[PDB]
Design a protein around this ligand. Structure first.
Ligand SMILES: *CC(=O)N(C)CCCN1c2ccccc2Sc2ccccc21
Length: 97
């Protein structure tokens, strides 16, 4: 079912290993067209999470900015954007340090 596939992908994105994170991202992109309104919004949040944990901050930011245009009152999405911003800001500083 779709709920079990999501839970599997969710756990992959929270895994301690980067192979799993990348797999979970792939599975999440597969689930996305088959999803209801609410499901897709969930998938997108964890796609931004997974990309953030992989240091793919520009992709993470792309997803979270869309989520915020769809659900502007989503405080969890606001927090994740804040974190992505902080990470990219510091990465830029370190690049020329
Ligand atoms: C989120 C999490 O880690 N849970 C719920 C424990 C079960 C983890 N797995 C899992 C991990 C590694 C290999 C196989 C499986 S089977 C499976 C199926 C659906 C959801 C999670 C998990």
């Amino acid at each position: 079912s779709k709920s079990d596939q999501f839970e599997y992908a969710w756990c992959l994105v929270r895994s301690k290993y980067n192979d799993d994170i990348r797999k979970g991202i792939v599975l999440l992109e597969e689930l996305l067209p088959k999803g209801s309104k609410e499901e897709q919004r969930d998938y997108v949040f964890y796609l931004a999470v997974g990309n953030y944990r992989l240091k793919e901050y520009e992709k993470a930011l792309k997803y979270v900015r869309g989520l915020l245009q769809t659900e502007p009152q989503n405080n969890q999405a606001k927090e994740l954007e804040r974190l992505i911003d902080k990470a990219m800001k510091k990465d830029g500083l370190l690049e020329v340090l």
